[PDB]
Design a protein around this ligand. Structure first.
Ligand SMILES: NCCOB(c1ccccc1)c1ccccc1
Ligand SMILES: NCCOB(c1ccccc1)c1ccccc1
Ligand SMILES: [Ca+2]
Lengths: 611, 611
C-alpha cells in the first residue's frame, strides 16, 4: 500500500499553505497582501511546506510571476534553496519554470543567476509506471520535453550543459526519445544536435551510452519510437546517385547487425517486452536486411539443421520401439487377472546381432542430447533460470522443452544402467515432445509457420486459461458420476469403478470421444439419466464456446497482427542461430567497407521507386 | 548469391570517382575546378569508371548540365561513347538525359547530334524481378515511362523511330503498358498514336507482335492493366445510335473470342499467373460476352457432358461391384485365424448369363477411358508434363486426376488379363476418384460451384499445409502409445499390437472418430491415462485451430474475392471445351460481319443505361 503516501503528503501540501498566511498569499495573486507580509516585519525566509517549499516555488507552480518578483528583494537566496526530500529531491524554481512553458520568469530568476546544475533526482522524477511522466532532472532536460523553443535557447546562453546525464546515465537526448508526444517533440532533436559544436574527442553526444549501455539511437528502437527512428535514420543514411524514380541510397549498418557482442540492435528488439517495439521491423533499412539474412543462407542452413533433426528423431524412434522386451518369466499374473502385462524390460541382454544395431542406434541419441546440453551450459549461465522463462514465451518457447527432452532422455539411459521397472515414464515423455518440437521448424519452411505461431498463442494464453475453467466443471459431474455408480456393480458398466479413472473417463467423455456409457442390458440408476444429460448440454456449450474463444482472438489475429508476429519470430531465430552457430560458415551481412573510402563500417544498400 | 555482384560493382562506382579528380569534379558543380582540369593539360578523354563511364555520364546522372557543357569543347565524341558492359550495355548520356525529366541538356547533347539509335540492352534493363524498374532500351522508350511531354516531341523532331523494338521485340508501346503508374502514363498512349501518320503497309504500330506473339492490346490484358485496357478499348468500339439513357454501342471482337489458334485473348487471361489480371473479366465487353457463351449453349451442352459422365460412373460402379468373387477353394485359412477372407477373384469364369451382362458393362468403361486417353495424347504433347502441373491448379486441377483415373482403370484390365491377386489396389483408386471427380461438374449447375471452388482452395493450400503439421504431432503419441502398449497384452485392448496400425489407429483417434481405446475390465498402465489425455487437449486444440484456419482465409473469401474466382473458373471451362469439342455444334460467339459493311470481323453489341 505504497501509493497512499503520495496523496497523504499531497494534501499535506494543501495543509501547510492553509495554515500559512504567507503561503496563502503564495496561492493567488495577493501582492498587495504580500505588501501586508514582508515590509511590515521580518518573517523568516525558510517557511518550509510539507516537503520543504518556499514562496517562489509555490508562486511559479501556481503560474505567478507577480508573486515571484516581490520576494526577490526579500530573499535572493531562495533560488539556491531546493525542495527538500522524499519525492522532490533537489527541485528548484528553475525546474518548474519551464514546466509552465514560460512566464518570462526564466530570465527573471536568471537575474538572480540561477544554477542549471541543479539535479532533482527525487522519487517522482525517475522512470516508473507509478509516475505518469518522465523528465530527467536537469532543467534543460525538462525544456526538451515541454517543446518550448527559445527557452532551450535561453539557458544554453547562460551556461547549460547538454552533455549532462541523469541518474541512469541517460543524457537529455534520451529524455526527448521517451516522450509519448513523439512527432511533436521530434523537431527538437536536430535543435539539440545544433549545439554540438565543440567536438569532444570521445563523442559528439549522439553515441553516448547509459548505464545499461544504450546509445539513444537504439534506445528509440528498443522502445519503438518508430517515427522518431526514421528522422534519426535519415542523417545516418548515405544516399548515392538517384536515377529518376529509383534511388540507390546506401544505409549505414554499424550497430544494426550483430557484431562482437556489444548488445547489438537486433537482439534488443527481440528481448524487449513492449510489443509496440516490434514494428521497428517494418522500417526501410531493417526489413530488407533481415530478408537477405533469411533468403541467402537463412532458411537453407536453418532447414538443414531441421533436416538432420527429424533424422535424429527417426533414429531415436527406431531405437525407441525396439526394446529389451522379454516374455513373462518371473511369475504368472496372479492379482485380479487385470495385470495384462508380460514384458518386464530385460536386464543385460545386448550381445545379439540385432541388439548391436540398436546400440549404435542408441548412443548417437544420448550423445546427441549432450550436444544440446552443451548449448545450454553457457546459455543457462547466460540469461539465468527463472528469467530464462522470461526469455522463452515471446520467441521460441519451443526452445525450453527441447531441454526437458534432454533431461528425460538422459535419465532414461541412467535408467537402463540401473534397469529399474519405471522405464516407460521417461520413454513416454522422451518420445512425445521429441516429435512435438519438430513444429518449431515449421517457421522455416514457408507458409507453415503462422499457424504454429497461432498454435503457441492459443495454448499459453487461452487454452490453459480455458483449462482452468474446464478442470472444475468436470470434477462435479465426474465425482457425481463416481458416487452414483458406487451403488452399481462395476462388472458391467465399468467406467467408474474407482475415483482416479472416474476423472479420466469423464475427461475423455467431455471431449465427446468416448461413446457415452450405457449398458442397455440392465437398468441404470435414475439420476444418471439426467445428470449425464446435464453434462451433455454443458458439453455442447463450453467447448463450443471454446471454439469461439478462438475467434475473439482470431479477429485480433491475421486481419491485423499475426503476420508481423511471424517475421518477428523469424528474426528471433535469426540472431540466435547467428549467435549459437560460430563463424567460418556465416559471412556477416551487408557489404564490407574498407575498400571504398568507408573504413571498418560495413554497409547495405537498397533500390526503391518514388512517385 | 548473384545479387551481391550488383552492389560490389556499385560501390566500385564510388571507388573510381573517388580516386579520379576529374570524376571528383564530375560529382558536384566544380566547373571552376573543371577549369583546373582540362585547360591546363591534356587529360585523356577515356577515363573509364567501374563499368566504363565518362564525365557527361556522371554529370547528367548527378543532375548537372553545368558540368555537361564544359566537356563539349573538350570532347565532342564522348556522346558517341556508351557505357561499357555487364550491367549497362550501350547506355549513353541521351538515355539518362530523359531519366532526370529534363535538364535542357536534351537539346544540348543534340547539339552534338546524339543518336537515338543507341540501344542499352544491359543487365539491369530487361524485365526481371531483380530489377525494380523496366524501361526498354531506346531513349524514346524511356521518355514514355517518365511522362515528359515535349521531351517526346523533341526527339521525334530529331529522327526518333517509334517503330523500333526491344530485345524481346516489344516496341515502345508495350513499354508504356508495363508501367506501374498506370493512369499517369495513360495520357501518353494517344500521344504516341498521334505520330503514326505514315501508314505502313504491314501495321500502323498498334498491331505489332513481339517474339512471344503479343500485340500490346492483349498484353495489357494478360498483364491486367485494367484502366489502360478501357482507354485502349474505347477507340476500338464502334458506337451506334444512342437512345436517351440507353446506347446500343457495338464492340469490335476480333482477337477477343477464340479464332483459329492465334493465341486468342481469353485463353491468355486463364493461362497467366498474375492474379490481378483476372479482373479484366469485370470489363464491359468481356463479362457479357462470356455470359452469352455460357447462357446459350454453355452449361446445357456442358452439363450434358456432365449428364453422360455420371452415367458412365454408374455403369462403372455396377461393373465394379459385381466381381468374379468365388468361394474359398484353394485352402482353409490356416494362419492366426486372422485371414478373414474367402473370395480370391476368379480366373476365367465369364460364360454365365450374368457375366455377359457385366462384360458389355465392362468394356464400355475401358474404351471410355481410351476416349479420355485420346484427349491427352495431343494435350500432353501440347503443354508438356511437368509444367502441365503449372496448368492444373489455377483452373481445373480436377482435370489431372481424371487421367490418373485412366491409368488405374486401364491397369486393372491389364490386371484381369493376368489375374494377379493384387486386384483391389487399382479398383479402390479407380472407384473413389471416379466419383470424386464429378464435383468438377459442380461449377456447371448453378450455386453449387463456389464451395467446390472453396473445396479446392482449402485443400491444396491450407489442409496439406495443415497435414504437414498434423502428421508429426501424431507420430509422438502414436509411437508413445506403441511403446506403452508393447508392455500390455494385445488380446484385450488390441488397438496397438504393432506399429503400422498404431499410426492409423492414432490417426482416426485424432479426428475423434475411433472411440478412444479403454477396456475398463482390467487395469491400464499408468502413463496411458495422462498421455492419452495429453493427446486429448491437443485434439481439442489444433483441429479446432484448423477450424479457424479456414476462417482467416474465409474473411479473405466471399466478402471479397471468391465470386470472381468462380467466374474466372467458368471461363477456364469455356475456352477449353471450345477447344476440345470441335466445330459443327458450337457456332462461334457474337454476330458475324461481312453482310453489313464490316467484313471478316465478327462483332458483339450490348445495351446499357447511363445517368
Ligand atoms: N534449439 C535450441 C533452442 O533455442 B531457441 C531459442 C534460443 C534463444 C532464445 C529463444 C529461443 C530456438 C531457436 C529457434 C527455434 C526454436 C527455438
Ligand atoms: N475432362 C478433361 C479435363 O480437362 B480440364 C482442363 C483442361 C485444360 C486446362 C485446365 C483444365 C477440365 C475442364 C473443365 C472442368 C474440369 C477440368
Ligand atoms: Ca463410439
Amino acid at each position: 500500500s505504497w501509493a497512499q503516501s503520495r496523496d497523504e503528503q499531497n494534501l499535506l501540501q494543501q495543509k501547510r499553505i492553509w495554515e500559512s498566511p504567507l503561503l496563502l498569499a503564495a496561492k493567488d495573486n495577493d501582492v498587495q497582501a504580500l505588501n501586508k507580509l514582508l515590509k511590515y516585519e521580518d518573517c523568516k525566509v525558510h517557511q518550509r511546506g510539507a516537503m520543504g517549499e518556499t514562496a517562489l516555488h509555490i508562486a511559479a507552480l501556481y503560474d505567478n510571476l507577480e508573486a515571484a518578483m516581490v520576494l526577490m528583494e526579500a530573499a535572493p537566496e531562495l533560488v539556491f534553496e531546493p525542495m527538500t526530500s522524499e519525492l522532490y529531491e533537489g527541485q528548484t524554481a528553475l525546474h518548474i519554470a519551464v514546466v509552465n512553458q514560460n512566464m518570462n520568469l526564466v530570465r527573471a530568476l536568471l537575474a538572480r543567476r540561477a544554477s542549471v546544475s541543479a539535479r532533482a533526482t527525487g522519487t517522482a522524477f525517475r522512470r516508473s509506471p507509478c509516475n505518469l511522466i518522465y523528465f530527467g532532472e536537469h532543467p534543460l532536460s525538462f525544456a526538451a520535453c515541454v517543446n518550448s523553443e527559445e527557452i532551450v535557447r535561453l539557458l544554453i546562453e547562460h551556461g547549460a550543459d547538454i552533455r549532462a546525464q541523469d541518474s541512469l546515465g541517460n543524457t537529455v537526448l534520451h529524455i526527448l526519445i521517451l516522450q509519448p508526444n513523439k512527432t511533436f517533440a521530434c523537431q527538437m532533436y536536430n535543435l539539440l544536435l545544433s549545439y554540438d559544436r565543440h567536438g569532444d574527442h570521445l563523442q559528439p553526444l549522439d553515441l553516448v551510452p547509459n548505464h545499461q549501455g544504450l546509445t539513444p539511437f537504439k534506445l528509440a528502437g528498443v522502445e519503438g519510437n518508430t517515427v522518431m527512428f526514421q528522422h534519426l535514420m535519415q542523417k545516418r543514411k548515405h544516399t548515392q546517385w538517384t536515377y529518376g524514380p529509383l534511388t540507390s541510397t546506401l544505409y549505414d549498418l554499424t550497430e544494426i547487425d550483430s557484431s562482437g557482442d556489444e548488445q547489438s540492435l537486433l537482439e534488443l528488439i527481440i528481448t524487449t517486452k513492449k510489443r509496440e517495439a516490434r514494428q521497428i521491423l517494418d522500417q526501410t533499412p531493417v526489413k530488407e536486411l533481415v530478408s537477405l539474412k533469411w533468403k541467402r543462407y537463412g532458411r537453407p542452413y536453418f532447414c538443414m539443421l531441421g533436416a538432420i533433426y527429424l533424422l535424429y528423431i527417426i533414429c531415436f524412434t527406431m531405437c525407441c520401439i525396439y526394446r529389451p522386451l522379454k516374455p513373462r518369466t518371473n511369475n504368472r499374473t496372479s492379482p485380479r487377472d487385470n495385470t495384462l502385462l508380460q514384458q518386464k524390460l530385460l536386464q543385460e541382454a545386448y550381445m545379439t546381432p540385432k541388439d548391436d544395431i540398436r546400440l549404435v542406434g542408441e548412443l548417437v541419441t544420448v550423445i546427441g542430447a549432450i550436444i544440446i546440453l552443451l548449448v545450454e551450459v553457457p546459455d543457462i549461465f547466460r540469461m539465468g533460470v527463472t528469467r530464462f522463462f522470461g526469455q522463452t514465451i515471446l520467441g521460441g518457447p519451443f526452445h525450453v522443452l527441447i531441454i526437458t527432452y534432454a533431461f528425460m532422455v538422459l535419465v532414461t539411459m541412467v535408467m537402463r544402467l540401473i534397469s529399474a521397472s519405471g522405464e516407460v515414464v521417461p520413454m513416454s515423455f522422451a518420445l512425445v515432445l521429441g516429435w512435438c518440437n519438430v513444429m518449431a521448424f515449421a517457421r522455416g519452411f514457408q507458409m507453415l509457420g503462422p499457424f504454429t505461431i497461432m498454435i503457441q498463442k492459443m495454448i499459453f494464453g487461452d487454452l490453459m486459461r480455458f483449462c482452468w475453467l474446464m478442470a472444475v466443471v468436470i470434477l462435479g459431474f465426474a465425482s457425481a458420476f463416481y458416487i452414483i455408480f458406487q451403488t452399481e456393480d462395476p462388472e458391467e458398466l465399468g467406467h467408474f469403478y474407482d475415483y482416479p479413472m472416474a476423472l479420466f473417463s469423464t475427461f475423455e467423455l467431455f471431449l465427446t470421444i468416448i461413446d457415452g456409457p450405457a449398458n442397455y442390458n440392465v437398468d441404470l440408476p435414475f439420476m444418471y439419466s439426467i445428470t449425464y444429460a446435464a453434462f451433455a448440454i454443458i458439453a455442447t456449450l463450453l467447448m463450443l464456446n471454446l471454439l469461439i474463444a478462438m475467434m475473439g482472438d482470431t479477429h485480433w489475429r491475421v486481419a491485423h497482427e499475426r503476420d508481423e508476429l511471424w517475421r518477428a519470430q523469424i528474426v528471433a531465430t535469426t540472431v540466435m542461430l547467428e549467435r549459437k552457430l560460430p563463424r567460418c560458415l556465416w559471412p556477416r551481412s551487408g557489404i564490407c567497407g574498407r575498400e571504398y573510402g568507408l573504413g571498418d563500417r560495413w554497409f547495405l544498400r537498397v533500390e526503391d521507386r518514388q512517385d
